[PDB]
Amino acid sequence: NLYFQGADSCIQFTRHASDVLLNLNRLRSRDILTDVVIVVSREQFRAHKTVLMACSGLFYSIFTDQLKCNLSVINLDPEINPEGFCILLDFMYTSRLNLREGNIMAVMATAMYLQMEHVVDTCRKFIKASE
Ligand SMILES: Nc1ncnc(Nc2ccccc2)n1
């Protein structure tokens, strides 16, 4: 699965980016090279800082701060919904957002807190649709 693109007809691999995420998610599943624990409502989630900061303005802020980037444990606001966070973390590693009637408000609040603008805009659009 490859194709050509641009002024220099460079070869692009269609599945490369998704294959990288698949492999990063496999690392996460096996706890390989995870370098941070996120604590949400007394539940712990192991992850890779680079993936978190690639997806979230809040994590980008934290992990580019000279002081804060040395923490191996990051606590979130205790009002954040841990399912909401799990849904968003899974999205970071898969591109798949498991949005449902019963979780959309929690997901949207969590995505606001995490500064995940495209997810927030998507939640808003689904909410507007059901008004
Ligand atoms: N997480 C994960 N799982 C499986 N394989 C890899 N990387 C890899 C292994 C062999 C050849 C090419 C890539 N990463």
PDB file of C-alpha atoms and ligand atoms in Angstrom:
ATOM      1  CA  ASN A   1       0.000   0.000   0.000  1.00  0.00           C
ATOM      2  CA  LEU A   2       2.083   2.850  -1.390  1.00  0.00           C
ATOM      3  CA  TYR A   3       1.510   5.836  -3.691  1.00  0.00           C
ATOM      4  CA  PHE A   4       3.254   8.909  -5.123  1.00  0.00           C
ATOM      5  CA  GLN A   5       2.804  12.540  -3.981  1.00  0.00           C
ATOM      6  CA  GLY A   6       4.035  16.162  -4.288  1.00  0.00           C
ATOM      7  CA  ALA A   7       6.432  18.096  -6.563  1.00  0.00           C
ATOM      8  CA  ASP A   8       9.225  15.485  -5.987  1.00  0.00           C
ATOM      9  CA  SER A   9       6.878  12.417  -6.372  1.00  0.00           C
ATOM     10  CA  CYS A  10       7.995  11.034  -2.986  1.00  0.00           C
ATOM     11  CA  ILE A  11       6.727   7.522  -2.107  1.00  0.00           C
ATOM     12  CA  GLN A  12       4.083   7.527   0.652  1.00  0.00           C
ATOM     13  CA  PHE A  13       3.135   4.436   2.640  1.00  0.00           C
ATOM     14  CA  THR A  14      -0.625   4.514   3.177  1.00  0.00           C
ATOM     15  CA  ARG A  15      -0.708   2.450   6.358  1.00  0.00           C
ATOM     16  CA  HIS A  16       2.545   3.705   7.929  1.00  0.00           C
ATOM     17  CA  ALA A  17       1.118   6.227  10.410  1.00  0.00           C
ATOM     18  CA  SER A  18      -1.648   3.838  11.556  1.00  0.00           C
ATOM     19  CA  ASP A  19       0.878   0.972  11.823  1.00  0.00           C
ATOM     20  CA  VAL A  20       3.099   3.144  14.046  1.00  0.00           C
ATOM     21  CA  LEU A  21       0.140   3.920  16.329  1.00  0.00           C
ATOM     22  CA  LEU A  22      -0.806   0.232  16.374  1.00  0.00           C
ATOM     23  CA  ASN A  23       2.723  -0.627  17.482  1.00  0.00           C
ATOM     24  CA  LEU A  24       2.796   2.190  20.067  1.00  0.00           C
ATOM     25  CA  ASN A  25      -0.468   0.868  21.488  1.00  0.00           C
ATOM     26  CA  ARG A  26       1.088  -2.612  21.661  1.00  0.00           C
ATOM     27  CA  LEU A  27       3.992  -1.122  23.635  1.00  0.00           C
ATOM     28  CA  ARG A  28       1.471   0.441  25.986  1.00  0.00           C
ATOM     29  CA  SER A  29      -0.404  -2.858  26.398  1.00  0.00           C
ATOM     30  CA  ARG A  30       2.858  -4.632  27.282  1.00  0.00           C
ATOM     31  CA  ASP A  31       4.173  -1.757  29.452  1.00  0.00           C
ATOM     32  CA  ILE A  32       7.246  -1.348  27.268  1.00  0.00           C
ATOM     33  CA  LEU A  33       9.047   1.982  27.577  1.00  0.00           C
ATOM     34  CA  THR A  34       6.098   3.639  29.339  1.00  0.00           C
ATOM     35  CA  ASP A  35       7.470   6.643  31.184  1.00  0.00           C
ATOM     36  CA  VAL A  36       4.531   8.196  33.043  1.00  0.00           C
ATOM     37  CA  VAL A  37       1.574   7.117  35.168  1.00  0.00           C
ATOM     38  CA  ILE A  38      -1.535   9.302  34.904  1.00  0.00           C
ATOM     39  CA  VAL A  39      -3.721   9.149  38.047  1.00  0.00           C
ATOM     40  CA  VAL A  40      -7.442   9.805  37.587  1.00  0.00           C
ATOM     41  CA  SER A  41      -9.922   9.361  40.462  1.00  0.00           C
ATOM     42  CA  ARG A  42      -7.477   6.940  42.197  1.00  0.00           C
ATOM     43  CA  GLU A  43      -7.102   4.839  38.978  1.00  0.00           C
ATOM     44  CA  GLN A  44      -3.693   4.654  37.280  1.00  0.00           C
ATOM     45  CA  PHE A  45      -2.963   4.645  33.564  1.00  0.00           C
ATOM     46  CA  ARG A  46       0.540   3.954  32.179  1.00  0.00           C
ATOM     47  CA  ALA A  47       1.491   5.793  28.967  1.00  0.00           C
ATOM     48  CA  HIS A  48       4.205   7.362  26.836  1.00  0.00           C
ATOM     49  CA  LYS A  49       4.749  11.105  27.367  1.00  0.00           C
ATOM     50  CA  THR A  50       5.493  11.674  23.682  1.00  0.00           C
ATOM     51  CA  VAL A  51       2.127  10.273  22.578  1.00  0.00           C
ATOM     52  CA  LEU A  52       0.286  12.246  25.274  1.00  0.00           C
ATOM     53  CA  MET A  53       1.948  15.517  24.251  1.00  0.00           C
ATOM     54  CA  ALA A  54       1.340  14.809  20.541  1.00  0.00           C
ATOM     55  CA  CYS A  55      -2.420  14.707  21.285  1.00  0.00           C
ATOM     56  CA  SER A  56      -3.139  17.057  24.229  1.00  0.00           C
ATOM     57  CA  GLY A  57      -2.359  20.709  24.880  1.00  0.00           C
ATOM     58  CA  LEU A  58      -2.322  20.092  28.627  1.00  0.00           C
ATOM     59  CA  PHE A  59       0.212  17.302  28.348  1.00  0.00           C
ATOM     60  CA  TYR A  60       2.245  19.362  25.839  1.00  0.00           C
ATOM     61  CA  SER A  61       2.392  22.155  28.440  1.00  0.00           C
ATOM     62  CA  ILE A  62       3.403  19.810  31.236  1.00  0.00           C
ATOM     63  CA  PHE A  63       6.067  17.825  29.401  1.00  0.00           C
ATOM     64  CA  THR A  64       7.727  20.918  27.850  1.00  0.00           C
ATOM     65  CA  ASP A  65       8.077  22.558  31.258  1.00  0.00           C
ATOM     66  CA  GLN A  66      11.631  22.239  32.587  1.00  0.00           C
ATOM     67  CA  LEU A  67      10.394  21.489  36.092  1.00  0.00           C
ATOM     68  CA  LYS A  68       7.317  19.389  35.408  1.00  0.00           C
ATOM     69  CA  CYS A  69       8.817  17.181  32.710  1.00  0.00           C
ATOM     70  CA  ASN A  70      10.766  15.299  35.430  1.00  0.00           C
ATOM     71  CA  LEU A  71       7.621  13.888  37.070  1.00  0.00           C
ATOM     72  CA  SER A  72       6.862  10.207  36.471  1.00  0.00           C
ATOM     73  CA  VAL A  73       3.398  10.508  38.072  1.00  0.00           C
ATOM     74  CA  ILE A  74       0.829  13.121  36.923  1.00  0.00           C
ATOM     75  CA  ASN A  75      -2.431  13.572  38.859  1.00  0.00           C
ATOM     76  CA  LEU A  76      -5.444  14.924  37.007  1.00  0.00           C
ATOM     77  CA  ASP A  77      -8.245  17.027  38.480  1.00  0.00           C
ATOM     78  CA  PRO A  78     -10.123  14.549  40.755  1.00  0.00           C
ATOM     79  CA  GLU A  79     -13.430  15.544  39.130  1.00  0.00           C
ATOM     80  CA  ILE A  80     -12.286  14.073  35.853  1.00  0.00           C
ATOM     81  CA  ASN A  81     -14.077  10.984  34.867  1.00  0.00           C
ATOM     82  CA  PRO A  82     -11.643   8.035  34.549  1.00  0.00           C
ATOM     83  CA  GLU A  83     -13.779   6.358  31.855  1.00  0.00           C
ATOM     84  CA  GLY A  84     -13.716   9.678  29.984  1.00  0.00           C
ATOM     85  CA  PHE A  85      -9.947   9.683  30.303  1.00  0.00           C
ATOM     86  CA  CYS A  86      -9.670   6.015  29.215  1.00  0.00           C
ATOM     87  CA  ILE A  87     -11.809   6.737  26.121  1.00  0.00           C
ATOM     88  CA  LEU A  88      -9.530   9.665  25.226  1.00  0.00           C
ATOM     89  CA  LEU A  89      -6.298   7.748  25.938  1.00  0.00           C
ATOM     90  CA  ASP A  90      -7.519   4.915  23.743  1.00  0.00           C
ATOM     91  CA  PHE A  91      -8.325   7.492  21.077  1.00  0.00           C
ATOM     92  CA  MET A  92      -4.812   8.925  21.284  1.00  0.00           C
ATOM     93  CA  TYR A  93      -3.347   5.495  20.540  1.00  0.00           C
ATOM     94  CA  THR A  94      -5.931   4.281  17.940  1.00  0.00           C
ATOM     95  CA  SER A  95      -7.737   7.210  16.212  1.00  0.00           C
ATOM     96  CA  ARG A  96     -11.007   5.606  17.392  1.00  0.00           C
ATOM     97  CA  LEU A  97     -13.304   7.590  19.705  1.00  0.00           C
ATOM     98  CA  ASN A  98     -15.968   5.492  21.415  1.00  0.00           C
ATOM     99  CA  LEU A  99     -18.565   8.262  21.765  1.00  0.00           C
ATOM    100  CA  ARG A 100     -21.990   7.284  23.143  1.00  0.00           C
ATOM    101  CA  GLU A 101     -25.058   9.058  24.544  1.00  0.00           C
ATOM    102  CA  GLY A 102     -24.138   7.898  28.040  1.00  0.00           C
ATOM    103  CA  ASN A 103     -20.527   9.112  27.924  1.00  0.00           C
ATOM    104  CA  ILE A 104     -20.495  12.193  25.644  1.00  0.00           C
ATOM    105  CA  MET A 105     -20.768  14.818  28.393  1.00  0.00           C
ATOM    106  CA  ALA A 106     -17.938  13.202  30.408  1.00  0.00           C
ATOM    107  CA  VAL A 107     -15.818  12.756  27.302  1.00  0.00           C
ATOM    108  CA  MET A 108     -16.323  16.385  26.263  1.00  0.00           C
ATOM    109  CA  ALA A 109     -15.454  17.727  29.716  1.00  0.00           C
ATOM    110  CA  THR A 110     -12.313  15.582  29.803  1.00  0.00           C
ATOM    111  CA  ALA A 111     -11.283  16.700  26.291  1.00  0.00           C
ATOM    112  CA  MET A 112     -11.743  20.347  27.342  1.00  0.00           C
ATOM    113  CA  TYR A 113      -9.552  19.780  30.385  1.00  0.00           C
ATOM    114  CA  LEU A 114      -6.929  17.969  28.240  1.00  0.00           C
ATOM    115  CA  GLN A 115      -7.050  20.675  25.521  1.00  0.00           C
ATOM    116  CA  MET A 116      -8.009  18.243  22.718  1.00  0.00           C
ATOM    117  CA  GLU A 117      -9.718  20.780  20.459  1.00  0.00           C
ATOM    118  CA  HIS A 118     -10.770  18.505  17.579  1.00  0.00           C
ATOM    119  CA  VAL A 119     -12.434  16.071  19.978  1.00  0.00           C
ATOM    120  CA  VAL A 120     -14.217  18.937  21.782  1.00  0.00           C
ATOM    121  CA  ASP A 121     -15.488  20.284  18.428  1.00  0.00           C
ATOM    122  CA  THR A 122     -16.739  16.786  17.505  1.00  0.00           C
ATOM    123  CA  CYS A 123     -18.563  16.372  20.812  1.00  0.00           C
ATOM    124  CA  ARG A 124     -20.187  19.809  20.345  1.00  0.00           C
ATOM    125  CA  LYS A 125     -21.364  18.869  16.863  1.00  0.00           C
ATOM    126  CA  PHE A 126     -22.935  15.611  18.113  1.00  0.00           C
ATOM    127  CA  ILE A 127     -24.639  17.484  20.985  1.00  0.00           C
ATOM    128  CA  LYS A 128     -26.034  20.157  18.627  1.00  0.00           C
ATOM    129  CA  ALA A 129     -27.425  17.374  16.422  1.00  0.00           C
ATOM    130  CA  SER A 130     -29.501  15.883  19.260  1.00  0.00           C
ATOM    131  CA  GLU A 131     -31.108  19.211  20.267  1.00  0.00           C
TER     132      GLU A 131
HETATM  133  N1  LIG B   1       4.913  -2.676  19.598  1.00  0.00           N
HETATM  134  C1  LIG B   1       5.409  -3.447  18.590  1.00  0.00           C
HETATM  135  N2  LIG B   1       4.868  -4.659  18.434  1.00  0.00           N
HETATM  136  C2  LIG B   1       5.405  -5.353  17.437  1.00  0.00           C
HETATM  137  N3  LIG B   1       6.390  -4.938  16.652  1.00  0.00           N
HETATM  138  C3  LIG B   1       6.851  -3.701  16.892  1.00  0.00           C
HETATM  139  N4  LIG B   1       7.895  -3.216  16.096  1.00  0.00           N
HETATM  140  C4  LIG B   1       8.467  -3.983  15.063  1.00  0.00           C
HETATM  141  C5  LIG B   1       8.926  -5.274  15.261  1.00  0.00           C
HETATM  142  C6  LIG B   1       9.472  -5.975  14.213  1.00  0.00           C
HETATM  143  C7  LIG B   1       9.560  -5.383  12.967  1.00  0.00           C
HETATM  144  C8  LIG B   1       9.105  -4.096  12.770  1.00  0.00           C
HETATM  145  C9  LIG B   1       8.561  -3.398  13.822  1.00  0.00           C
HETATM  146  N5  LIG B   1       6.389  -2.904  17.850  1.00  0.00           N
END
